[PDB]
Write a protein that binds this ligand. Sequence first.
Ligand SMILES: CCc1cc(Nc2ncc(C(=O)Nc3c(C)cccc3Cl)s2)cc(C(=O)NC2CCNCC2)c1
Length: 292
Amino acid sequence: TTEIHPSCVTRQKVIGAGEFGEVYKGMLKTSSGKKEVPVAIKTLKAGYTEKQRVDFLGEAGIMGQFSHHNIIRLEGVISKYKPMMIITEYMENGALDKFLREKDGEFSVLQLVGMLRGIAAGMKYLANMNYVHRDLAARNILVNSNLVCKVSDFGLSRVLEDDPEATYTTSGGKIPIRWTAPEAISYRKFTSASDVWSFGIVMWEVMTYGERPYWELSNHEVMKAINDGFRLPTPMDCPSAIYQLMMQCWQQERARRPKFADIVSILDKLIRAPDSLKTLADFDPRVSIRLP
Ligand SMILES: CCc1cc(Nc2ncc(C(=O)Nc3c(C)cccc3Cl)s2)cc(C(=O)NC2CCNCC2)c1
């Protein structure tokens, strides 16, 4: 990985914090002749354990193996000086879940579907690279000023450990139940096909402008509903093709789910023939307004 000297990094504002470090927006100056570029910077505070160092630098190591438009790009690391830092491109619109909730109703259906195609292309790349995400969710997608959505949050075990949506289960594992495929919940089987289930949940998150999956149902009630065969209902204003696709992501039998290649192909064809998105799935209303 590229080693960046600390004098090249200016931390400007905290944008995220945890117990063992923070995420900042800042600037990176590589050379005398080129203007500084905005970056995100994540630190690791003094006293970190061996495991913390391995996990922290391991996220950078994984990210440095990837080169794809829809995967967060690493600028480099500070490892020769303390505090250690990871420096990435700066995604101006932040996390997709919060972005959607703050921009409710502001996009066209075609823009929303384009977000999904970008996420799907990043996931196809990760799956092809033999990288299983385990925590695919709108909160772990970042959005730039071109509306490009990039997958983020990498690592072997730090990902689920660090995410407060991942909760301890009766069996002892820590997982984000509402996003996780049944085989991953039941027996800890995380594969690219469990990431496909999660992708279907992200599709529902995007098309609802960031609604919370399953609304107020508890984690146990979500699992019971999925095992009973229930699935999330159609969002309002959702293209039929898009709801069909998310429902195929949620097949109980892992082998019946589409692969990411199939998802990318379908989304790209829908976008290329955008009238295809004008046919909407029926929406089931919770409330009846009657007027004479
Ligand atoms: C987490 C929420 C978030 C994210 C970002 N942009 C980011 N871009 C890259 C980030 C990052 O975390 N990079 C990263 C680093 C630095 C190290 C390891 C892994 C990763 Cl993925 S965070 C920017 C903001 C932010 O403060 N403001 C924007 C403007 C105000 N409204 C929200 C978006 C908020």
